[PDB]
Amino acid sequence: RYDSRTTIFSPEGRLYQVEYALESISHAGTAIGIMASDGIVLAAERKVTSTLLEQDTSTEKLYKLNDKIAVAVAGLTADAEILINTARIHAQNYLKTYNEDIPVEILVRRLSDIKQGYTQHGGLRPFGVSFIYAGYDDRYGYQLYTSNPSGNYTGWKAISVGANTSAAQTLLQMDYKDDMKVDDAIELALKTLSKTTDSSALTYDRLEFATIRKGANDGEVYQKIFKPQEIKDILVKTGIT
Amino acid sequence: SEYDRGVSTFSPEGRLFQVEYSLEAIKLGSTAIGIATKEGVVLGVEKRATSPLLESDSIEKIVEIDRHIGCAMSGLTADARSMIEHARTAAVTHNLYYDEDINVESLTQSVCDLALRFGEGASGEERLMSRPFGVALLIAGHDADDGYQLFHAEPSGTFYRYNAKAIGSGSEGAQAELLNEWHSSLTLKEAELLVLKILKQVMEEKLDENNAQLSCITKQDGFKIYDNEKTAELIKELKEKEAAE
Amino acid sequence: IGTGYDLSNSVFSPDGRNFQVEYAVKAVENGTTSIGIKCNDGVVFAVEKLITSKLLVPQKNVKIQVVDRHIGCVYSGLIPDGRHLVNRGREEAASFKKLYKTPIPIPAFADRLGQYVQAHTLYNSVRPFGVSTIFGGVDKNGAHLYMLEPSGSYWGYKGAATGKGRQSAKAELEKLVDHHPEGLSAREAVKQAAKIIYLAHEDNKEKDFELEISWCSLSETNGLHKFVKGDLLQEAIDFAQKEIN
Amino acid sequence: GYDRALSIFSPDGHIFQVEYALEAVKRGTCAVGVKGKNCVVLGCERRSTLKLQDTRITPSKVSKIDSHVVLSFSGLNADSRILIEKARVEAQSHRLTLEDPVTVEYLTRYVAGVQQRYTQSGGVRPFGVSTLIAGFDPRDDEPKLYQTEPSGIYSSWSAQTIGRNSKTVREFLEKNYDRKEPPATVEECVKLTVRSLLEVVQTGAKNIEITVVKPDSDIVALSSEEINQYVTQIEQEK
Amino acid sequence: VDVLDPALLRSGRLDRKIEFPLPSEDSRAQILQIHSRKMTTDDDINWQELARS
Amino acid sequence: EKPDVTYSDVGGCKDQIEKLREVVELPLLSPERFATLGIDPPKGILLYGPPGT
Amino acid sequence: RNNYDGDTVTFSPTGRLFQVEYALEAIKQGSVTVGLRSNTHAVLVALKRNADELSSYQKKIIKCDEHMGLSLAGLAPDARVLSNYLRQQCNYSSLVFNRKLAVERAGHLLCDKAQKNTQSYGGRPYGVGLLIIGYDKSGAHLLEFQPSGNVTELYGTAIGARSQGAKTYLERTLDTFIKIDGNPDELIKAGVEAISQSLRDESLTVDNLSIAIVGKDTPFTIYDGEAVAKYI
Numbered sequence A: 001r002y003d004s005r006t007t008i009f010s011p012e013g014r015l016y017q018v019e020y021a022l023e024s025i026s027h028a029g030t031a032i033g034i035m036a037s038d039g040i041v042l043a044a045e046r047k048v049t050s051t052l053l054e055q056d057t058s059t060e061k062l063y064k065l066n067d068k069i070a071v072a073v074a075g076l077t078a079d080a081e082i083l084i085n086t087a088r089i090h091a092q093n094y095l096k097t098y099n100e101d102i103p104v105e106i107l108v109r110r111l112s113d114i115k116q117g118y119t120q121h122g123g124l125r126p127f128g129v130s131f132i133y134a135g136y137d138d139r140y141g142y143q144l145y146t147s148n149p150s151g152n153y154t155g156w157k158a159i160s161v162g163a164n165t166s167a168a169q170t171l172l173q174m175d176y177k178d179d180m181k182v183d184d185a186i187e188l189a190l191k192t193l194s195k196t197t198d199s200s201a202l203t204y205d206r207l208e209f210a211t212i213r214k215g216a217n218d219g220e221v222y223q224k225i226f227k228p229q230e231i232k233d234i235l236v237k238t239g240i241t
Numbered sequence B: 001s002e003y004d005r006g007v008s009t010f011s012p013e014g015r016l017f018q019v020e021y022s023l024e025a026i027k028l029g030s031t032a033i034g035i036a037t038k039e040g041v042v043l044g045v046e047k048r049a050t051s052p053l054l055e056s057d058s059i060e061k062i063v064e065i066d067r068h069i070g071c072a073m074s075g076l077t078a079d080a081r082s083m084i085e086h087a088r089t090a091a092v093t094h095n096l097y098y099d100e101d102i103n104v105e106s107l108t109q110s111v112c113d114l115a116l117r118f119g120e121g122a123s124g125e126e127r128l129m130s131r132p133f134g135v136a137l138l139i140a141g142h143d144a145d146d147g148y149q150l151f152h153a154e155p156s157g158t159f160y161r162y163n164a165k166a167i168g169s170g171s172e173g174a175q176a177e178l179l180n181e182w183h184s185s186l187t188l189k190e191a192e193l194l195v196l197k198i199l200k201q202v203m204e205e206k207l208d209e210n211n212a213q214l215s216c217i218t219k220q221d222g223f224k225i226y227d228n229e230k231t232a233e234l235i236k237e238l239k240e241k242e243a244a245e
Numbered sequence C: 001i002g003t004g005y006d007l008s009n010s011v012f013s014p015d016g017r018n019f020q021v022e023y024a025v026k027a028v029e030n031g032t033t034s035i036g037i038k039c040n041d042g043v044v045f046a047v048e049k050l051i052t053s054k055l056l057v058p059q060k061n062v063k064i065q066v067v068d069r070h071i072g073c074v075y076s077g078l079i080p081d082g083r084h085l086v087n088r089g090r091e092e093a094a095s096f097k098k099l100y101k102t103p104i105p106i107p108a109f110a111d112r113l114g115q116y117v118q119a120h121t122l123y124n125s126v127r128p129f130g131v132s133t134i135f136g137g138v139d140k141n142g143a144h145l146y147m148l149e150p151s152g153s154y155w156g157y158k159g160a161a162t163g164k165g166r167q168s169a170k171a172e173l174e175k176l177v178d179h180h181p182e183g184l185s186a187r188e189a190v191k192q193a194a195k196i197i198y199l200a201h202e203d204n205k206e207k208d209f210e211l212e213i214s215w216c217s218l219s220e221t222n223g224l225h226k227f228v229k230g231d232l233l234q235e236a237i238d239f240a241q242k243e244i245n
Numbered sequence D: 001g002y003d004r005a006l007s008i009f010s011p012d013g014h015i016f017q018v019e020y021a022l023e024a025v026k027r028g029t030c031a032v033g034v035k036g037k038n039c040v041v042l043g044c045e046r047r048s049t050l051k052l053q054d055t056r057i058t059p060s061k062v063s064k065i066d067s068h069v070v071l072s073f074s075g076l077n078a079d080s081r082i083l084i085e086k087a088r089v090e091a092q093s094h095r096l097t098l099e100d101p102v103t104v105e106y107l108t109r110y111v112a113g114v115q116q117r118y119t120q121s122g123g124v125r126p127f128g129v130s131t132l133i134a135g136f137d138p139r140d141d142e143p144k145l146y147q148t149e150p151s152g153i154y155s156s157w158s159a160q161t162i163g164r165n166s167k168t169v170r171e172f173l174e175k176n177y178d179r180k181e182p183p184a185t186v187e188e189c190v191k192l193t194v195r196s197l198l199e200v201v202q203t204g205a206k207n208i209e210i211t212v213v214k215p216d217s218d219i220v221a222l223s224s225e226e227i228n229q230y231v232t233q234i235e236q237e238k
Numbered sequence E: 001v002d003v004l005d006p007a008l009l010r011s012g013r014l015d016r017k018i019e020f021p022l023p024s025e026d027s028r029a030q031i032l033q034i035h036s037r038k039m040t041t042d043d044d045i046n047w048q049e050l051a052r053s
Numbered sequence F: 001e002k003p004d005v006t007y008s009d010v011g012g013c014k015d016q017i018e019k020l021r022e023v024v025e026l027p028l029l030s031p032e033r034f035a036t037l038g039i040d041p042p043k044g045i046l047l048y049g050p051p052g053t
Numbered sequence G: 001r002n003n004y005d006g007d008t009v010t011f012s013p014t015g016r017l018f019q020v021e022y023a024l025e026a027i028k029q030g031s032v033t034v035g036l037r038s039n040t041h042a043v044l045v046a047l048k049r050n051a052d053e054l055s056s057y058q059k060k061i062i063k064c065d066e067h068m069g070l071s072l073a074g075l076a077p078d079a080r081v082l083s084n085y086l087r088q089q090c091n092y093s094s095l096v097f098n099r100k101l102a103v104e105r106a107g108h109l110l111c112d113k114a115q116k117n118t119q120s121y122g123g124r125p126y127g128v129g130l131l132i133i134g135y136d137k138s139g140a141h142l143l144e145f146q147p148s149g150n151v152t153e154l155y156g157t158a159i160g161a162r163s164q165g166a167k168t169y170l171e172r173t174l175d176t177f178i179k180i181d182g183n184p185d186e187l188i189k190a191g192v193e194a195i196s197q198s199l200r201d202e203s204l205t206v207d208n209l210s211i212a213i214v215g216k217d218t219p220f221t222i223y224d225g226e227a228v229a230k231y232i
């Protein structure tokens, strides 16, 4: 085998390290980002739950990297940690330098470059983490992206990474309508998350949620994390609980 | 084997098989022929095309290192960009330092110094190139003091002066022909048709100016890389000569 | 054996040891008889330097080297490797003389040398030494002789011996303690060294030897290191010749 | 086994990494460059995967280095990314030093030089990308189309295909194209570039991407509607 | 030495275990000599010098 | 018996072919020289190699 | 095994290095040269090998300085790096101490240099012998450099291919050529006879002879062509 390092290729010119790093994302739970006309909703899944586990101090797969762009996380979390910080620091470096907030495409481009750079040179490991970037910039309004652990990005109107990628993708696109209401965006997220997930009863503590809107509080990109007691309500509207 | 996985590791023969192997890279690249005369050295080459869409008039394999020092090459061109780069710098830094023409021989050594570099470090020549060079040069020029000289700079070994040398793919059959057809009585015009005559023999292609390129070092004419018409004219004379015979 | 242990020199075996350091010692076995004879008013060094053929020049190559002007050293094993440890000793010795304005104590030298050897077992981009080094001199607190193993072990020695014929050499030293319970004068311990090395040459009998003897003695060399040569050395030769026959 | 480093050679003199890099190009979609008498059209296969995927926010296969140099690529998308920004800066640094618009020769030679530098090194791989660097200059009216290869070797060719199933597309282009007569008009340059691409797309007239570069710093990227008139024009003659 | 059967590895079936090494430097020169006394010898030959090789 | 093969039907006048001549022909013509030197004349040979040579 | 043959930092079980041993093999494959000396003169005579007869030879003598120089046997790249380091040392000595550094003192620095690449991980070992000559206040000297890096002071030596017949010649005539002092012709003469004996597949020509001589009244001078026409 030729999986000894990033430098070395197989006969066919593929690199196994990239391949393993894709597979790493799908051994941690489903993550779904939906863009809609009236907001972009992010929703993610808890791969951990113990009866004495707490998860009310923090979301372990959602970080705001700037006051206008936030990311949902899929992969190993230690690997995740390093990069979340690198991105958020780079964001504010842009803010310091230009006195305005970072455009989405630059932010994604920076992290895929860093991730590729670890493949291109040295001994350092590639870091298999897939971020779903949901942002607003005046270039293309709402923008939903994801980053590959292969170290490039693609724009989206919906994407799912994490566990059950095939399952999440067809289900989301079947009930996609070009428009989409932000309430329906929420309703859809919960429905696809139940089916994918092997915990029969999808409760609010198995859910992370944020909705991102400039259609609420106009002239201002406002990202808002839902609290448990709000998540608890919407489950009763979708009839899970 | 096992002695081609270390560059500081010798064979039970006392040799380096990493280096040995780089000789076969030199041989892999297409044939180059140089022939020194008492009037100038004529440097001819082979090129290859697979499509006519290849611009054959805007590719390099005879390169100008100075206006009186020229070179041919054979082997990997990835390695050659770097090799030719170093050697340009030396000629220029000599005129920087001195206001006088570099020596052909002296240039030959400097090139081989960059060739020596296989790893990192080493005193009196800090090594920055990480693998064996896969490129050789036929180095032809003129300093007054030693007239017109032809060397073959060998990254594996060190430099050997030649009075005529063929490298590349067609080297073994050429060398024998070049024994029987290097003289101390060669003229520059005759040398020109000689080079083409030897090239054709070992070229399994068609002789044309599109895959050939003559050039001379004549110290009174400067380094002149030839035109397509000019070389075409030499292809034409060659054919009338050998038709009569 | 394999699996580390003898392939790397910082990796330990289940035996709690390293087999490469045993191999470092084995190269000492292969090296030639060197003794140091501690005395109560000096120290004496003798060495057997074999003669390979008679084209060699007489008394012009040694293994006796000096540090400062009062510390003699001689190494057995691998010759060019043994030079470099003494050379490294000099650089260390020089630093002591700079900072403290005084010659080095022989127990100070023994500590610094043993750190240098021990370092070459902590890294794996390094090779160990493969030499023992008998050394010592006279200082403040008198004469001291130490001997350093390629192991990085040392202890004080009333007699030190290394090289191939050291079995004979160690027995003769112990006889020397018994016959003279002060270890004899430094003048006669030179002669005593010659009788040892000649018997040690019954283990090396196939070729010829050259006896080089040096000393450093409290009042017989006036606290300085010098080579033992001329009528002193001629004496040693003669005493030694007499006493084998 | 001699395909483990770029400091170990085979008895034939190859570094299989470069050879396996050329197979990597083939993973990335085709790109085709063809020059005319007063233009170069740099045309490429584009991918439309899903309704969710966009085009606005979803990378183009053409990136414009500057206003008088353009660049297409084929290979892995991540590798070309670092190379393009790197290429763009190099292109700027020309003007910074010299104060002149970037030469196309200068650009192909440095950019593959970055590739070359990596290949020369044994401790790091180079890129797995082959590019087309096409352009003009405000001084020179001669149209130029250059190539890079993953070895860090740059070559110049009148017309070339690289990328996915390039070889098959190549043979068709040889025949129609002549060094004695390239396409006279721009529209005709485009028709040939399209005829070549039809082959790789199978069907898909949103999947054929056309860009045109002419001298005096004219770069245009053609509307969807314009690309579509060619496809329909080529089917009536077909 | 690790193909020796356990039958004979028990005391009183072997008692002397006697090692033959690969001829050392001093040993090569002597072996070479006897081979050389089947054919003509000359003053040219120095076995010590062949043994080093 | 008596092949209809010579060193025209073999290409190359290889190194092995030059050492091959010495084994068969040379001590057959003259066993005198071998006797005097004090070597016992070559008569065994093993030709071996990859297939198709 | 020869699994200790994979490194330069790993001693074998018998306490050898295979790396230093293979380097001895490379001297043998290298071109023959003879050193010898007298109290007042020292000479290297070396066989100048061409790759063919369109090839105009190769210099086997590198001038180190005006009182030093070396010849080679084995690797040509290797002779080149250590010649650069050695030349720097001669310059250094002359710059800082106003002095022609003793041959033997010079030779301990080149010995270390070798052992640097023996100690370290990376660094190619050296697989060349150099015969060093010089003439200082302490007269002529002759050193034989090893690929180990050991230094041996002899009155006479030869290394390279077929060089053992030249050692048997010199041994016999050892005391003869030493006593000749103030006569370079004879010492020169001796080095020619030695290297006659070596020959196989070669005959001496004018341009196989390179004689390098330093002495009591002689600069380091390398003699070639019409000046070795009196000694062909």
Ligand SMILES: Nc1ncnc2c1ncn2[C@@H]1O[C@H](COP(=O)(O)OP(=O)(O)OP(=O)(O)O)[C@@H](O)[C@H]1O
Binding pocket: F009, F010, F011, F012, F050, F051, F052, F053
């Ligand atoms: N030396 C040669 N001259 C001409 N042809 C040759 C030569 N060597 C091999 N060939 C061709 O190869 C054919 C088959 O190989 P051949 O019988 O010579 O080989 P081998 O290595 O002795 O074989 P095997 O493993 O079959 O015993 C011959 O019939 C002949 O045509």
